């Protein structure tokens, strides 16, 4: 296909230009005060929503440039939110001012690379400063409230995920299943929790969550990849006689056997899941080892002898029930014998006895800690069905929350933190002047999110933008009681790895987007 | 007449390109390797001239905006140029480079006032920096060297200039005369030149050189304001059987008056100037009683009881030839009792004596020193009379480049000076951030010129700028020779007021463009 | 008068275009074989003609940048013409090969300053190379053998111009006539002749040969400059009221004077000739003292006292006819005293001897040679009138070409003489490589115009060019008779002032051409 | 020596070569500035003056050239500058064939659009 090709600052203008459209569409949302925004769907039913992440995911430009600018501060801030959980809307308005101050900087005749460097200087040591200011919330207390202000100020879901994640441990992995009974409960179960994700996104069964679950399905353990569908056919065919879904777990699928799969799973004529092999190699196999262990199957190993063909429903791992997402996969409370869990980790305890290197014992103890911990299983109980749901939506959303919080802490939300850094660095200097244009850049970038809030609200931007600025600590201007006080004590707080993640990434996206000097998209 | 208006950036915008057709046309001839500019001609014959003033005067767009922007940049140039009598094409390349590089940093948005003071601050510093580095050229053989120097390395020029300012003085008034014989003659006669200038520019009998000329002219000396075509009427008709140009001399002339003298001018029936009295007051009767004194003539005024209608051939005033310009007229050898004069003088030298004041001593030693010193008069003489013109052209315009030497010295030609003094001001800061980016816009524009002057000779502009900024002092490249050294040892000189005019009028007008924000013009 | 600007490139390549056009008009016309052009009279008589001076004369494009191209080559050429007395083709073609060759390597990235020092380097070189091929025409019988060849091969032309340089000298004033009778006369005649012109075109009588001519018109002698036409009107009504034309010789005559004798002069109601008066200051009254006594009237001087008012008739001077052209003009049989003229060159002899400087003696020799040689007048006879003004045509034709010939000698013609000088020159070399590419171009310009000739004789232009530069001396090729040889010997006479004319004034152009960056001109 | 001084380094050397005729010395005037070039775009990459720049490496010799990283010039190979003798010939002889064969071109065929 044709390309059309764009140099310097049109295309630079076209990519603003998109970045533009996309942070006004998203930015409305932004804040308590925030708007709302309607997306059209195909059915005919609009939908109204104050959520940007959604907002984000609709939208994109018909001019191809502007559709570029418009994607990659998606992707970034969709990474933001995978990696925190919050934050996409503030990554997107952080980027959008960036890429302004430091494109028109760039008109001005400046160094773009000088200009990256010095925002990347700047963002490095606003998180110097965010490290410094976050508070810990590590004890119990502080777990209950951070979750309560997370869940929409609910007291019960605060209480819950504290209960929770005292009794799995801080490290621990906690689920939210749907409650049969008006009351809540919480147990645990033998099951672990590795960093594969599904192979493809076909594989969703939810688009509402953008996971696979699968309630009482089949594990298969391969130890080699698989490629041909005729290998694991009449595994295929014999877990779909039994009419229960299938999950699959090999080095890699690939090719016509993921094809075919995916083809299986669009259709429903059978619940196929696959998920590629934690670690590789050694660590490989001794995950594999692990899993089949837990859910009381056997791996498919080539050098053993064993193939896929003879595999039997016997064979098969059982689980009561998995969760599959794209960054990680769960299993829950799967059919094993206890005394093969115990000879397991003790054979797994011997094994960081005999071992030597620091790295062997870590990844053993790391081995051993998810084998043995278990999984902690929230059922989300209430009245009726309907806000049986919200109730549970609320509860794995405050969970998101609460474990960034006791991974990186707390800081004052709302916006006022990054005010509080850019106050901090106001002195900072860098080699050149172009980077010291790039710090002031940087520094009204993290200035700007907290005016868009206060404009939300409908207040003066630069007003409250300068008292905040007055004041020093936590202390902040609140939304939506509309007058200003200590922000962590008021009830606003943001997880300082929410509010790092979405300044890291927009840093970076806004470096990227200054120094591009080249664009390449097919023709119209 | 309804008015169009543009506000902000786009009037920028425009006045930007009118000021850069303007320097590209004008910048060209820049230079020894200056090439040159063909000029259209009503007639047929197109002009083909390396002078930038003539290419600058010819020079108005078609665009309201565009032509906004280059007549206020050709005023500035103008009246650079009438200061100086050089610096021209020197003034609008600076200015251009100023107004591209401020307009620049407003778009990038910094604020046009701190600009502009930051412009101002590097320009004093500038002015500063040149007065340290200019040369004296009070000795008579400096002053025949530069004079030599200007008039294209003709021994005979210096020279003739360094022995007219001997037997006159420094600040004497010499004028050029046209040569009877081959050989070049030096007279001084009595006369006299004040800071008057004539009315309208439509009184130039010769536009080449823009001023006005008489031969035998008879002087007209009003005390009163002259207003009223028939209070002077008969006067006009007696000279004009009379056959001479008419020269009068009063405190003001407007209305009818004046416009029924330039529709004669235009018509040319009767060569008829007016300039207005010099001084205000006390000061300027006593200096139309001098003038009166020196031409022969009878000042009328109405306080003594004659009127205009009763002013006949002998109460008007006479002299050899005189000559007027924009910024000064020139009276030259007017005829008047010797020992007139000197009763005259030896008045004003005991009126010096019995002086009580400072300003009323220096006021009247300037009055008898214009009256007794007279005026130097060159007759530039040759074998053939085109080269007689020739020769008698590079003589005004060596004595204009002398005059300015022995005003303000002299530092090196061809555009290092302003390099040196960039060089010297590396340092230099303001109070605010946009104060040290127009410090660093004036900067780069004194670099500018002799950039421009090395790509007309076609070299490396970057690499002949860094290597004149690593040298020290006066050395620096040679655009004719194509290599570096002392310019001052090579006779590339330039004067210092030259320079400094040219500088601060590019200042000043750029820093009204910085500073404009409205425009306001007639429709198309 | 708003302008329309053109920078570099675009503007060289509409004055390319220009010259293209004016050169292809011309070009034809060139050689014996050459084309003829047809221009269009607005009365309704299409005129053929194969003269090149008529159809550049006539040319002027649509385009304001064409037309600067035209008309600056139009210029040149026609100062060659006026210069030497032909070769405006030539120049033109010349000229045009050069700027052509010239903007092509301006395009390829060459500096124009050192292709314009190329080329005027190998332009001297080629003055040079000229002069030693020339040949000398001194002799008697060489200056009938050019008068012949120059008038279409006429032996009586040629004999008669050989005995009227004979009996005038070398230097001596020829001027043509109309005969009375069959046979053609030759008479010496008491006239001066001086290098002062017309004041403006208007003033031309006869547009063929661009020259004002008068029949025993009156000489007014003005020791002043004149601008007011009041001061001659008595003259010039008692002039106008005699019936004989008025000639005026003044310093300059200017203003309202000047307008009014041009509209007299198109409306044609009193046919008056203006001349500025020659020589400047001492000089200038003893030639106007001279030109006084040889017509027989007075010089009107102001320092004497009278005026123009109390001039009459007896007092203007009266000769049989006088002849004025741009360059020159000439006065023929002045009633004036032999004696008295007698006396005035005894003085001036006697003023020589007392002389003591030697350029007051060359001045003095050169009055007095103009005084007493007098002019030869040739009066051409035939039987019948159109065939008499068709012959005093080829003889002024053949008496400009005499003059050219015995004040430069004479090289081969028909444009072997440029290849000649190419062919000697090929091995001159410059200090830069700019420079050889313009010695190049100068080369290969030369070369054109033989190339250009044989073209129009329809046969192949690169064969004869190497043929006539595989030879040696005057060997070169005939247009006429198709066949090489020797064309001093053929017949094919050029005078080598023409040649050297047209190379300097289209190497003149050339580089000023190539130089031009801008241009100012009218909207459309 | 790596970041295109090598070829600056060569033009350097052979900045007196002749050919048969004049447009042969053009070509090779052509090339010098082609292999001049290279260093010129990372400098100007860089952001710094591609002239000023170029004359300085060219006034140096041996391994002696700026350095884009660290803005400073010096002896690339011992600032770990490098870059194989093969990928630099190679690139020099390939971008001559491919200009070779663009120069000579006269003609062109193509389908219509």
Same mark, same amino acid.
């Given at each position: 296909?044709?390309?059309?090709?764009?140099?310097?600052?049109?295309?630079?203008?076209?990519?603003?230009?998109?970045?533009?459209?996309?942070?006004?569409?998203?930015?409305?949302?932004?804040?308590?005060?925030?708007?709302? /925004?309607?997306?059209?769907?195909?059915?005919?039913?609009?939908?109204?929503?104050?959520?940007?992440?959604?907002?984000?995911?609709?939208?994109?430009? *018909?001019?191809?440039?502007?559709?570029?600018?418009?994607?990659?501060?998606?992707?970034?801030?969709?990474?933001?939110?995978?990696?925190?959980?919050?934050?996409?809307?503030?990554?997107?308005?952080?980027?959008?001012?960036?890429?302004?101050?430091?494109?028109?900087?760039?008109?001005?005749?400046?160094?773009?690379?000088?200009?990256?460097?010095?925002?990347?200087?700047?963002?490095?040591?606003?998180?110097?400063?965010?490290?410094?200011?976050?508070?810990?919330?590590?004890?119990?207390?502080?777990?209950?409230?951070?979750?309560?202000?997370?869940?929409?100020?609910?007291?019960?879901?605060?209480?819950?995920?504290?209960?929770?994640?005292?009794?799995?441990?801080?490290?621990?992995?906690?689920?939210?299943?749907?409650?049969?009974?008006?009351?809540?409960?919480?147990?645990?179960?033998?099951?672990?929790?590795?960093?594969?994700?599904?192979?493809?996104?076909?594989?969703?069964?939810?688009?509402?969550?953008?996971?696979?679950?699968?309630?009482?399905?089949?594990?298969?353990?391969?130890?080699?990849?698989?490629?041909?569908?005729? +290998?694991?056919?009449?595994?295929?065919?014999?877990?779909?006689?039994?009419?229960?879904?299938?999950?699959?777990?090999?080095?890699?699928?690939?090719?016509?056997?993921?094809?075919?799969?995916?083809?299986?799973?669009?259709?429903?004529?059978?619940?196929?899941?696959?998920?590629?092999?934690?670690?590789?190699?050694?660590?490989?196999?001794?995950?594999?080892?692990?899993?089949?262990?837990?859910?009381?199957?056997?791996?498919?190993?080539?050098?053993?002898?064993?193939?896929? *063909?003879?595999?039997?429903?016997?064979?098969?791992?059982?689980?009561?029930?998995?969760?599959?997402?794209?960054?990680?996969?769960?299993?829950?409370?799967?059919?094993? *014998?206890?005394?093969?869990?115990?000879?397991?980790?003790?054979?797994?305890?011997?094994?960081?006895?005999?071992?030597?290197?620091?790295?062997?014992?870590?990844?053993?103890?790391?081995?051993?800690?998810?084998?043995?911990?278990?999984?902690?299983?929230?059922?989300?109980?209430?009245?009726?069905?309907? =806000?049986?749901?919200?109730?549970?939506?609320? /509860?794995?959303?405050?969970?998101?929350?609460?474990?960034?919080?006791?991974? +990186?802490?707390?800081?004052?939300?709302?916006?006022?933190?990054?005010?509080?850094?850019?106050?901090?660095?106001?002195?900072?200097?860098?080699?050149?002047?172009?980077?010291?244009?790039?710090?002031?850049?940087?520094?009204?970038?993290?200035?700007?999110?907290?005016?868009?809030?206060?404009?939300?609200?409908? =207040? =003066?931007?630069?007003?409250?933008?300068?008292?905040?600025?007055?004041?020093?600590?936590?202390?902040?201007?609140?939304?939506?009681?509309?007058?200003?006080?200590?922000?962590?004590?008021?009830?606003?707080?943001?997880?300082?790895?929410?509010?790092?993640?979405?300044?890291?990434?927009?840093?970076?996206?806004?470096?990227?987007?200054?120094?591009?000097?080249?664009?390449?998209?097919?023709?119209?």
């Amino acid at each position: 296909a044709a390309k059309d090709v764009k140099f310097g600052n049109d295309a630079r203008v076209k990519m603003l230009r998109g970045v533009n459209v996309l942070a006004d569409a998203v930015k409305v949302t932004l804040g308590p005060k925030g708007r709302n /925004v309607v997306l059209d769907k195909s059915f005919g039913a609009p939908t109204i929503t104050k959520d940007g992440v959604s907002v984000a995911r609709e939208i994109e430009l *018909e001019d191809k440039f502007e559709n570029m600018g418009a994607q990659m501060v998606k992707e970034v801030a969709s990474k933001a939110n995978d990696a925190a959980g919050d934050g996409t809307t503030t990554a997107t308005v952080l980027a959008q001012a960036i890429i302004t101050e430091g494109l028109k900087a760039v008109a001005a005749g400046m160094n773009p690379m000088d200009l990256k460097r010095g925002i990347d200087k700047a963002v490095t040591a606003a998180v110097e400063e965010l490290k410094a200011l976050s508070v810990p919330c590590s004890d119990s207390k502080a777990i209950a409230q951070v979750g309560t202000i997370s869940a929409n100020s609910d007291e019960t879901v605060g209480k819950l995920i504290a209960e929770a994640m005292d009794k799995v441990g801080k490290e621990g992995v906690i689920t939210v299943e749907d409650g049969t009974g008006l009351q809540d409960e919480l147990d645990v179960v033998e099951g672990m929790q590795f960093d594969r994700g599904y192979l493809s996104p076909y594989f969703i069964n939810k688009p509402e969550t953008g996971a696979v679950e699968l309630e009482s399905p089949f594990i298969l353990l391969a130890d080699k990849k698989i490629s041909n569908i005729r +290998e694991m056919l009449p595994v295929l065919e014999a877990v779909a006689k039994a009419g229960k879904p299938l999950l699959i777990i090999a080095e890699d699928v690939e090719g016509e056997a993921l094809a075919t799969l995916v083809v299986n799973t669009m259709r429903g004529i059978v619940k196929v899941a696959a998920v590629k092999a934690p670690g590789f190699g050694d660590r490989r196999k001794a995950m594999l080892q692990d899993i089949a262990t837990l859910t009381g199957g056997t791996v498919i190993s080539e050098e053993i002898g064993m193939e896929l *063909e003879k595999a039997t429903l016997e064979d098969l791992g059982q689980a009561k029930r998995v969760v599959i997402n794209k960054d990680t996969t769960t299993i829950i409370d799967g059919v094993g *014998e206890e005394a093969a869990i115990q000879g397991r980790v003790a054979q797994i305890r011997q094994q960081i006895e005999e071992a030597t290197s620091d790295y062997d014992r870590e990844k053993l103890q790391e081995r051993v800690a998810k084998l043995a911990g278990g999984v902690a299983v929230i059922k989300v109980g209430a009245a009726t069905e309907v =806000e049986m749901k919200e109730k549970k939506a609320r /509860v794995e959303d405050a969970l998101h929350a609460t474990r960034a919080a006791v991974e +990186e802490g707390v800081v004052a939300g709302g916006g006022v933190a990054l005010i509080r850094v850019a106050s901090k660095l106001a002195d900072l200097r860098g080699q050149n002047e172009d980077q010291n244009v790039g710090i002031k850049v940087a520094l009204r970038a993290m200035e700007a999110p907290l005016r868009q809030i206060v404009l939300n609200c409908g =207040e =003066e931007p630069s007003v409250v933008a300068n008292t905040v600025k007055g004041g020093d600590g936590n202390y902040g201007y609140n939304a939506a009681t509309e007058e200003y006080g200590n922000m962590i004590d008021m009830g606003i707080l943001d997880p300082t790895k929410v509010t790092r993640s979405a300044l890291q990434y927009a840093a970076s996206v806004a470096g990227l987007m200054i120094t591009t000097e080249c664009m390449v998209t097919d023709l119209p």
